[PDB]
A paper describes a structure:
Colony collapse disorder (CCD) is a multi‐faceted syndrome decimating bee populations worldwide, and a group of viruses of the widely distributed Dicistroviridae family have been identified as a causing agent of CCD. This family of viruses employs non‐coding RNA sequences, called internal ribosomal entry sites (IRESs), to precisely exploit the host machinery for viral protein production. The IAPV‐IRES found in the intergenic region of the IAPV virus belongs to the well‐characterized type IV family of viral IRESs. IRES sequences from this group dispense with all canonical initiation factors and are able to assemble by themselves an elongation competent ribosome, successfully redirecting the cellular machinery for viral protein production by an RNA‐only mechanism. Using cryo‐EM, we comprehensively characterized how the intergenic IRES of IAPV, a virus of the Dicistrovirideae family and a causing agent of the colony collapse disorder (CCD), binds and manipulates ribosomes to redirect them toward the production of viral proteins.
The binary IAPV‐IRES/80S complex populates three major conformations, with limited differences between them. Class 1 is unrotated, while classes 2 and 3 exhibit a small rotational movement of the 40S. An apical view along the axis of the PKI of a superposition of class 1 versus class 2 shows the IRES displacements are minimal and are followed by the H69 which constantly interacts with the IRES. Apart from the interactions established by the apical loop of the SL‐III with ribosomal protein uL16, the decoding event elicited by the placement of the PKI in the decoding center allows the establishment of an interaction with the 28S rRNA base A3760 (A1913 in E. coli), normally involved in decoding (Demeshkina et al, 2010). This interaction is maintained along the small fluctuations of the 40S, which, locally, are restricted to displacements of a few Angströms. No populations with wide rotations of the small subunit were identified in our large 80S/IAPV‐IRES dataset. This suggests that, in contrast with Cripavirus IRESs (Fernandez et al, 2014; Koh et al, 2014), the IAPV‐IRES is able to restrict the dynamics of the small subunit, channeling it toward a canonical, non‐rotated configuration. The limited dynamics of 40S subunit rotation observed in our large cryo‐EM dataset reflects a solid anchoring of both ribosomal subunits, mediated mainly by the additional contacts contributed by the SL‐III characteristic of Aparavirus IRESs.
Author numbering:
A (entry chain Y): 2 to 72
B (entry chain W): 1 to 83
C (entry chain An): 1 to 25
D (entry chain S): 2 to 133
E (entry chain b): 2 to 99
F (entry chain B): 2 to 218
G (entry chain X): 2 to 130
H (entry chain D): 58 to 278
The structure:
RNA sequence: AGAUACCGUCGUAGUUCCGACCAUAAACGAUGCCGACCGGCGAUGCGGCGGCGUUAUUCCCAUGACCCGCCGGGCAGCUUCCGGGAAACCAAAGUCUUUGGGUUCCGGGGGGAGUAUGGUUGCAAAGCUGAAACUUAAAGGAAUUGACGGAAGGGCACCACC
C-alpha cells in the first residue's frame, strides 16, 4: 500500500477494485465477453452432432496426425 | 538460558562485544579477545592478572576498534585521563 | 520489422480503415 | 635457446641450501659431488643442474640468492647483530624544532628544554600541487 | 545494461548541449559527447624544416604552428583509432596518457 | 600508562621524538587522526601530539606482554624503511619477523609450509603491509599497527600514531616499542638508559654502505 | 514534511543502533517521544536520556547500548481492542517472551502487557525489541 | 586412520585437553580440520545429500560437465551445517562436500515459545536468512507441530533437532542452491540475535591459545 | 544482379522570421515529489564568515586577483563489507520477513495492440481514453563460459613473408 492513512479505505478498496481488472483470470470470470465466446457457454460438457472428420497435423517436433472430429 | 525450572537449558552462552554490546557469532572469525597486561604502580612490569576487551568483526572493518579500545582503556584505569 | 516502421504501417492502414468508413456519410 | 627447467633450477636450489660446504666456484669440483648428493638416471640432466649450481655459487659471493636461507644468511644478520655506529641523530644539542610545536610541548611538562634550538614560522604558505 | 555511469558524454545538469559537427564525417554529435582533440603542430614537420632555414631571409625565424581543434563523432574517432575499446575497469580512467 | 609517574613521558624521550621527525606528519588527514593530532602547521604538515604518540605505545607494549608466548607475536614490514627495524625486534623480544614479502595466504592456507597460526600481529604501514590485515581479519588475530596521519585505522585494534614514512623516524618508533616490551617482561630498569642504540634498528641504505669505507678513511 | 514525530525521531535512533553509535541526537522532542523512550528505559533496552530545552520544540540525546535490536513505529494510529491485541503481538513481535508493542491507552502510554493487566486498549504507537 | 593434526586449534583436540567444541563456538575460532567434527559430534552424526546438480562450462569443442553435492549434516541435538563442493564425478563431490559441511557446522539456539517450561523444542525468535533472492523465515511454533515446510528446509531443521517451527520461503526457491543456504543462514543467525536472556554481561574467559600455551610450545617448534 | 539505397551532382517542401495550431521524443538520470536519518575525501559553483603574506589603483585604506580553512545550498566526482540487489551497480536503488513517515501516478506471462470500437480535441496529420475474440510455453533481465566478427591490440612460423 503506497497510501497507508487512517481514513484511506475509499482509495485502498477503489484502487484494488480498478487494478483487479488487470488480473487476466479475474477479468475473464467477470466480463460478458469471455463467457459468451466459450463454445460450451459455462458448461462442463456438451453433446454435438459430428458433421465431418479432420486429420489435424501434430504441432511441432512430433510429426504425427492427431485424427480429430469437427462437431 | 533459564527454563521455568531455572537450570541452563542451552549448550553454550556466547560472547558479547565489549565496545558495542552486539553479540559475537560462532563463526565471526574477525573477532578479537585482546588481553592487556597489568602493570604495578612502582615496578612497571607484568603481574599475572590480565585486562581483557573483545570487539566483533563488524567494528574492525568499520575502523572504530582503536577508537573503542582507546575508550575501553581511557576510563577503565590503563591510559591517561588527559591523554 | 522495426517497432518504428511497424507503428508507421499501422498508421498508413488506420488512414485507410478511416477512408473505408468515410464513404458511408 | 638454453633456459633452465624446474627439474634443473629447483633441483640446484635444494642442493645449495643443504650443501653450501661440498660445492664451490669451479664446475668440475661440484659436477662430481652430484654423483653423491643426487641419484640421477641421466648424464645430461646432471650437467644442466651442476652447471646452474656454479652460476648461483657466484651469487652467494656477490649478494644473496632468491630461493636460499642458509647459516651464512643467519651469519649475515649475526655480523650486524650489534652494529653500533658513531653518535647518531639522537645525540644532537642544536635540533630544528617547528615553532608551532613549541605550543604542544608547553601544555605538557616540557615548557622549555636544554638541548633544543627554536626557528621562526614560514609566511607565504604555498605547499599544494597545482590542480591538473 | 547501463555500460557507462555518465551516458557516454559529460553533461550532468543541462539536458541539452548544442551539437558541433564531426570532421571525418559530418555527424551531428553533441559538444560534450564528441571526442575533442586540439592539435598544436609545426606547418612543416621535421624533414622540410632542415631546408627552409637556409631560404629564410631573416635571422633564425622560428616557424608558425598550425592550430586545429578536431571534433570527432564516435564512429569516426574509432575508425581513425583516436580512441579505443578498454577493459571493464580500464574504461573509467579519465587520465590522458602522454 | 594512566596517571602513573613511572610510565610518564621521560625527559630523554621527547628529544628523540623531535630529532627523529615523528611530529613531522603528512599533508592529507584521515578523519580518525584528529584524535591523535594537536594542530595543523604552516606548509600543510600535521603535528602528531607526542603524548598521544607515547600513551598508545605503552598499551601496545602491555598487549605484546599480555601474550604469554613471545614467539607467536608476528611483526611485519614489507616497505624497506622498517624491514631491519622489525628484524632487530625479533631476536631481542623473542618474536617472529616478516622483513619483506608476506606470502598472501599464510594464516588461512594450512598446507603452505610457512603456516604461521599467530596470536597477535604488529604492522609497520597499514597501506603497504595491508595483506596480513585481511588474513588477520579471517582468523581470530588481533592487529597492532605503527599508524600515520595518512594511513587508515582500518582492521587495526590498537594504533601507534607515528611518522612511519621517514627513514630514521621508523626504527626509533620500533626501538621505543622494543624497549617497553623488554622493560615490562623484566630485562631493563627505568633508572638507566638501555645499552642497545636506536640507530642499530635504522635500515642502512645500500647507497650509504658504499660510503662509510671513505667517510672515516 | 515531517508528518509523524514518533516515526522520524525513532527512525533516527535505529540508524545509531545498526551503526553502533553510543548516543544519538533525535531532533523533535514531543510528549509522545519521552513517554515512548521511558517505556524503553523502564523496560531497560536503552540507557537514560535528557531533553534539551530551547524556546522551540526541544531536542533529545539518548544514551544507547547495543541491547536494542529494532525500534519499529506503526503509522497511522490504528485502534486496538484486547482480543485484536493478540494478533498485533503475533505478526509484529519476534517471540512471545520478549519484545513489547507500546500503545496509547486512555490510562496513559504503556506497553501491551500493562494494557493487558489494566484491561484497556487504545490507538497503537509502535513496537521495540 | 590417525589424523596427525596441522592447526593449533586442532592440535589440542586429539590429546583430549580441550573438553569439547563448545569453547570453539565461544571464541569463534575456525574449525579448518575435518576430524574435529568426527571426534566430538561425529558420534550421533547423520549425513544426507539433498541435490546432485551437474554444471556445464562451454569449452572450445564439447562441454566439461562437473557434478555438485549439496550435503546437509547434523547430530539431532543442536548442530547442523551446509557443504557445497563441485567435482567432475559423483563419488568425489559427495565424499568431498561432507568435509566442507563439517568445516561449517554451526550451533542452533533452540528454546521455548509461550510458557518456558519442559524441554527445549523450537527456535526462540523470528530469525531470517536470505542468499540469492530466496528468503526463508523461521518462526517459533506451539509444541508437537512438526516442521511445516518444504521437503528440503524441513530436512535440515529435522537434522538440527528443531522440532517446532513455522517456515515462510519467499523468492525463487526453485534453485536448491540458494534454498538450502538461506534456511541454513536463519539457523546460523539464532546465536547472532541479542535476546534479553543474554544480558548477564559476558566476562572474557581465557582463550585456549592462552590457557594451553605451554602445551603449544613443547609439542612442536 | 538489382538497388525509387549507402557515394556524387542539382533540387521541391522544409530550414528563417512574424501570427496561430499541434501536444508528441531514448521529453532518459529509462530512477515522481516534500521530510528525516545513516561513511569518508579531493574538487568545484554561488553567497556569507574567519585567517599570515603576495601582487593591483600606492597616496594608506576600503576592496578585488590569489591564499589557508569554515559554513550554507546546488552540479557531479572519488573511495568503502554502512547497507542493499537477480546481478550489473547505487550515500541511494540504503535504513524492507526485524515488513507501516506522508502522498500522487502506475505494473500484473508473451503476443493480439496502443489494434477494434464508442467518446473527445484537431484545418488535417493525429492525440488522450481503450478492449475483446483468438493465440502461445515462453518473451525477458543481469551475468558466466565458449564459438564467432569484414572489432582493437600482442605474438609464432620458410606447411607465412622478406
Amino acid at each position: 500500500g503506497k497510501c497507508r492513512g487512517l481514513r484511506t479505505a475509499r482509495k485502498l478498496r477503489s484502487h484494488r477494485r480498478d487494478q483487479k481488472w488487470h488480473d487476466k483470470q479475474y477479468k475473464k470470470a467477470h466480463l460478458g465477453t469471455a463467457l459468451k465466446a466459450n463454445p460450451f457457454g459455462g458448461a462442463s460438457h456438451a453433446k454435438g452432432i459430428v458433421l465431418e472428420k479432420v486429420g489435424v497435423e501434430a504441432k511441432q517436433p512430433n510429426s504425427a496426425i492427431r485424427k480429430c472430429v469437427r462437431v | 538460558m533459564q527454563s521455568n525450572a531455572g537450570e541452563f537449558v542451552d549448550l553454550y552462552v556466547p560472547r558479547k562485544c565489549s565496545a558495542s554490546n552486539r553479540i559475537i557469532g560462532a563463526k565471526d572469525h574477525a573477532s578479537i579477545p585482546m588481553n592487556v597486561a597489568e602493570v604495578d604502580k612502582v615496578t612497571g612490569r607484568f603481574n599475572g592478572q590480565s585486562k581483557t576487551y573483545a570487539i566483533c568483526g563488524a567494528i574492525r572493518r568499520m575502523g572504530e576498534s582503536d577508537d573503542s579500545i582507546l575508550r575501553l582503556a581511557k576510563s577503565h584505569g590503563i591510559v591517561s585521563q588527559n591523554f | 520489422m522495426r517497432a518504428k516502421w511497424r507503428k508507421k504501417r499501422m498508421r498508413r492502414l488506420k488512414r485507410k480503415r478511416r477512408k473505408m468508413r468515410q464513404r458511408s456519410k | 635457446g638454453r633456459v633452465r627447467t624446474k627439474t634443473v633450477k629447483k633441483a640446484a636450489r635444494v642442493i645449495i641450501e643443504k650443501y653450501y660446504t661440498r660445492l664451490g666456484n669451479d664446475f668440475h669440483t661440484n659436477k662430481r659431488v652430484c654423483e653423491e648428493i643426487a641419484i640421477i638416471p641421466s648424464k645430461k640432466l646432471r650437467n644442466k643442474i651442476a652447471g646452474y649450481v656454479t652460476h648461483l655459487m657466484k651469487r652467494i659471493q656477490r649478494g644473496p640468492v632468491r630461493g636460499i636461507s642458509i647459516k651464512l644468511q643467519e651469519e649475515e644478520r649475526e655480523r650486524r647483530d650489534n652494529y653500533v655506529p658513531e653518535v647518531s641523530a639522537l645525540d644532537q644539542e642544536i635540533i630544528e624544532v617547528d615553532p608551532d610545536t613549541k605550543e604542544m610541548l608547553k601544555l605538557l611538562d616540557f615548557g622549555s628544554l636544554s638541548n633544543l634550538q627554536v626557528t621562526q614560522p614560514t609566511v607565504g604558505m604555498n605547499f599544494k600541487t597545482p590542480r591538473g | 545494461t547501463k555500460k557507462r555511469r555518465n551516458n557516454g558524454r559529460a553533461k550532468k545538469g543541462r539536458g541539452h548541449v548544442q551539437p558541433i559537427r564531426c570532421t571525418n564525417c559530418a555527424c551531428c554529435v553533441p559538444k560534450d559527447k564528441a571526442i575533442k582533440k586540439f592539435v598544436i603542430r609545426n606547418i612543416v614537420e621535421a624533414a622540410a624544416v632542415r631546408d627552409i632555414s637556409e631560404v629564410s631571409v631573416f635571422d633564425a625565424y622560428v616557424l608558425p604552428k598550425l592550430y586545429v581543434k578536431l571534433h570527432y563523432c564516435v564512429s569516426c574517432a574509432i575508425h581513425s583509432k583516436v580512441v579505443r575499446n578498454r577493459s571493464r575497469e580500464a574504461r573509467k580512467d579519465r587520465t590522458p596518457p602522454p | 600508562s594512566g596517571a602513573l609517574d613511572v610510565l610518564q613521558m621521560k625527559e630523554e624521550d621527547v628529544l628523540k621524538f623531535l630529532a627523529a621527525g615523528t611530529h613531522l606528519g603528512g599533508t592529507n588527514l584521515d578523519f580518525q587522526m584528529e584524535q591523535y593530532i594537536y594542530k595543523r602547521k604552516s606548509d600543510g604538515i600535521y603535528i602528531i601530539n607526542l603524548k598521544r604518540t607515547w600513551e598508545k605505545l605503552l598499551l601496545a607494549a602491555r598487549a605484546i606482554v599480555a601474550i604469554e608466548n613471545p614467539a607467536d607475536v608476528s611483526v611485519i614490514s614489507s616497505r624497506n624503511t622498517g624491514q631491519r627495524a622489525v628484524l632487530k625486534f625479533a631476536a631481542a623480544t623473542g618474536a617472529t619477523p616478516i622483513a619483506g614479502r608476506f606470502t598472501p595466504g599464510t594464516f588461512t592456507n594450512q598446507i603452505q609450509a610457512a603456516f604461521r597460526e599467530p596470536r597477535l600481529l604488529v604492522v609497520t604501514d597499514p597501506q603497504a603491509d595491508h595483506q596480513p590485515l585481511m588474513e588477520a581479519s579471517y582468523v581470530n588475530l588481533p592487529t597492532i599497527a605503527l599508524c600515520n596521519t595518512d594511513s587508515p585505522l582500518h582492521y587495526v585494534d590498537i594504533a601507534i600514531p607515528c611518522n612511519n614514512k621517514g627513514a630514521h623516524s621508523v626504527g626509533l618508533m620500533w626501538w621505543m616499542l622494543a624497549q617497553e616490551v623488554l622493560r615490562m617482561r623484566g630485562t631493563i630498569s627505568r633508572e638507566h638508559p638501555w645499552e642497545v642504540m636506536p640507530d642499530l634498528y635504522f635500515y642502512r641504505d645500500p647507497e650509504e654502505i658504499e660510503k662509510e669505507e671513505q667517510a672515516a678513511a | 514534511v515531517r508528518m509523524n514525530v514518533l516515526a522520524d525521531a525513532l527512525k533516527s535512533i535505529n540508524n545509531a543502533e545498526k551503526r553502533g553509535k553510543r548516543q544519538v541526537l533525535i531532533r523533535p522532542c514531543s510528549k509522545v517521544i519521552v513517554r515512548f523512550l521511558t517505556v524503553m528505559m523502564k523496560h531497560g533496552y536503552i540507557g537514560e536520556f535528557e531533553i534539551i530545552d530551547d524556546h522551540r520544540a526541544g531536542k533529545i540525546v539518548v544514551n544507547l547500548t547495543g541491547r536494542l535490536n529494532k525500534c519499529g513505529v506503526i503509522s497511522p494510529r490504528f485502534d486496538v481492542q484486547l482480543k485484536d491485541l493478540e494478533k498485533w503481538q503475533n505478526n509484529l513481535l519476534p517471540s512471545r517472551q520478549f519484545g513489547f508493542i507500546v500503545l496509547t491507552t486512555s490510562a496513559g502510554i504503556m506497553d501491551h502487557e500493562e494494557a493487558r493487566r489494566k484491561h484497556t486498549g487504545g490507538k497503537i504507537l509502535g513496537f521495540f525489541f | 586412520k590417525e589424523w596427525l593434526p596441522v592447526t593449533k586449534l586442532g592440535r589440542l583436540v586429539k590429546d583430549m585437553k580441550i573438553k569439547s567444541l563448545e569453547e570453539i563456538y565461544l571464541f569463534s575460532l575456525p574449525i579448518k580440520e575435518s576430524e574435529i567434527i568426527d571426534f566430538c559430534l561425529g558420534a550421533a552424526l547423520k549425513d544426507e545429500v539433498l541435490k546432485i546438480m551437474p554444471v556445464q562450462k562451454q569449452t572450445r569443442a564439447g562441454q566439461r560437465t562437473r557434478f555438485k553435492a549439496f550435503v546437509a549434516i547434523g547430530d539431532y541435538n543442536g548442530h547442523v551445517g551446509l557443504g557445497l563442493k563441485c567435482s567432475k564425478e559423483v563419488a568425489t563431490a559427495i565424499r568431498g562436500a561432507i568435509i566442507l559441511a563439517k568445516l561449517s557446522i554451526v550451533p542452533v539456539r533452540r528454546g521455548y515459545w509461550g510458557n518456558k517450561i519442559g524441554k527445549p523444542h523450537t527456535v526462540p525468535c523470528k530469525v531470517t536468512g536470505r542468499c540469492g533472492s530466496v528468503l526463508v523465515r523461521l518462526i517459533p511454533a506451539p509444541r508437537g507441530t512438526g516442521i511445516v515446510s518444504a521437503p528440503v528446509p524441513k530436512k535440515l531443521l529435522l537434522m538440527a533437532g528443531i522440532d517446532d517451527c513455522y517456515t515462510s520461503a519467499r523468492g525463487c526457491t526453485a534453485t536448491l542452491g540458494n534454498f538450502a543456504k538461506a534456511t541454513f543462514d536463519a539457523i546460523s543467525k539464532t546465536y547472532s540475535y541479542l535476546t534479553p536472556d543474554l544480558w548477564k554481561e559476558t566476562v572474557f574467559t581465557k582463550s585456549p591459545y592462552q590457557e594451553f600455551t605451554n602445551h603449544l610450545m613443547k609439542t612442536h617448534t
